[PDB]
């Protein structure tokens, strides 16, 4: 019995009449590149992708960010080509590259990277860390406003926040120094939310910081809607995501009904839902910036739980499922003597009635 | 010899999924292979069989010699067996309030 294939079978478009005439993958890398392209295509048979790949929603992810900047590709391409010609014109650069002694200035690369691919690299990275999934329920935005956040450590050092690097709760004991490029007259909102720190609800967050109606980049002048509370990752609960969100405001907004008291040491009040917060204020507010770090427990978290939050320090453990054993047989034929140890409960000798 | 666990069957870690003398079925995700080509489960969960593109190891001279002679655009396929893990690795539970 035969069932006809449900679609094009692999390798059917290969004409085997002229087999000796056809070109071949004389190389391994050549075959591999075609194989990986084949693995990526949709197939009518069962695939690893069907069973293991994440099931993304069919509808495209709604964009909620600022519009892309307007650029003239023509003028850019011209200026871009001009610059390379000057580099290649130099005879010294050719010699260092030929002698394998040249290098790139990483500081300049980073500087330019912030303005070209940075925003889109920050979006894919925030998507891999699942922030749009949790903060906005899948809605995406390109953080087109570079946001610089640094925790002051000591007197001469700073600890940047970047996107996913690890900052300790001790380093983040006190509010970070924040700076960004904004025009005069613009209004912004900055919040810090722990995505993973909530101790009661799995789907909720903690509002660690809220600054509203900031004038331009003058963060200090912003309304202290929610005071800064350092991250408190519980011990043995793993690594937590801490996300700064910079919002561009269309107008001055009144957040009096969502303000938390100062100081705010009630975890029930700091319970927060960014998707609910933004949905309420989406009409006059737009996400613009994005930075975030990872945070695990350190000794300083005890002080937060004991003193600031006035509670006991919760401790967690990673607990694995109990090991599987088949049902015990009366006669475990050919099993080793220790088969009985697998179904024993205690190691100390028992005595029954005696 | 042959399949011991068909499509959709629940396996525990260690379960021999199939025995064979030559590779009819290739190991996929969470499926180990013993030195007699025995396919066995590395995790607990559900057995799947799929058709995947076959890319040999560059040190496997005989298989690499095969693909290098293939016409451009021709891709080899094999049948793979997988185990979709049923349970997570563990959970975080409250052990103290100190």
């Amino acid at each position: 019995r035969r069932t006809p294939p449900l679609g094009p079978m692999p390798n059917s478009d290969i004409d085997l009449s002229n087999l000796e005439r056809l070109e071949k993958y004389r190389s391994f890398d050549r075959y591999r590149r075609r194989a990986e392209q084949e693995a990526q295509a949709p197939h009518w048979w069962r695939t690893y992708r069907e069973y293991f790949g994440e099931k993304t929603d069919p509808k495209e992810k709604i964009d909620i960010g600022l519009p892309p900047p307007k650029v003239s590709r023509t003028q850019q391409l011209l200026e871009r080509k001009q610059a390379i010609q000057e580099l290649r014109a130099n005879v010294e650069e050719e010699r260092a590259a030929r002698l394998r002694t040249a290098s790139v200035p990483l500081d300049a690369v980073r500087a330019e990277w912030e303005r070209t691919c940075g925003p889109y690299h920050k979006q894919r990275l925030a998507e891999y860390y699942g922030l749009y999934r949790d903060l906005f329920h899948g809605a995406t935005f390109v953080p087109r406003v570079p946001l610089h956040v640094a925790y002051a450590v000591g007197e001469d050092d700073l600890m940047p926040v970047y996107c996913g690097n690890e900052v300790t709760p001790t380093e983040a004991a006190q509010a970070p120094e924040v700076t960004y490029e904004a025009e005069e007259g613009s209004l912004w909102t900055l919040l810090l939310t722990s995505l993973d720190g909530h101790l009661l609800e799995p789907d909720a967050e903690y509002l660690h910081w809220l600054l509203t109606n900031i004038p331009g980049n003058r963060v200090a002048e912003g309304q202290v809607t929610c005071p800064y509370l350092p991250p408190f990752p519980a011990r043995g609960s793993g690594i937590h995501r801490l996300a700064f969100l910079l919002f561009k405001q269309d107008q001055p907004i009144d957040f009096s009904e969502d303000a938390r008291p100062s100081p705010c040491y009630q975890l029930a009040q700091r319970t927060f839902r960014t998707f609910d917060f933004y949905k309420k204020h989406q009409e006059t507010m737009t996400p613009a910036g994005l930075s975030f770090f990872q945070c695990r427990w350190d000794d300083s978290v005890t002080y937060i739980f004991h003193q600031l939050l006035d509670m006991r320090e919760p401790v967690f453990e990673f607990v694995r499922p109990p090991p599987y054993h088949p049902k015990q047989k009366r006669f475990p034929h050919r099993q080793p003597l220790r088969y009985l140890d697998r179904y024993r409960d205690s190691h100390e000798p028992t005595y029954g009635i005696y | 010899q042959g399949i011991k666990k068909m499509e959709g069957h629940y396996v525990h870690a260690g379960n021999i999924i199939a025995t064979q003398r030559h590779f009819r079925w290739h190991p996929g995700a969470h499926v180990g292979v013993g030195k007699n080509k025995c396919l066995y489960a590395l995790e607990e969960g559900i057995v799947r069989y799929t058709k995947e593109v076959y890319v040999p190891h560059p040190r496997n001279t005989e298989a690499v010699d095969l693909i290098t002679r293939l016409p451009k655009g021709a891709v080899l396929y094999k049948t793979f067996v997988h185990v979709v893990p049923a349970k997570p690795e563990g959970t975080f539970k409250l052990v103290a309030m100190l």
């Binding site: 019995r1 035969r2 294939p5 000796e20 048979w45 | 002679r69 016409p71 021709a74 094999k78």
Partner: peptide
């Protein structure tokens, strides 16, 4: 499997030239 629409997907010997001394 022979009764399945995907039977033969692993066929490859027809794509190679016959080299049998």
């Amino acid at each position: 499997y022979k009764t399945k629409p995907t039977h033969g997907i692993g066929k490859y010997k027809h794509l190679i030239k016959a080299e049998e001394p």
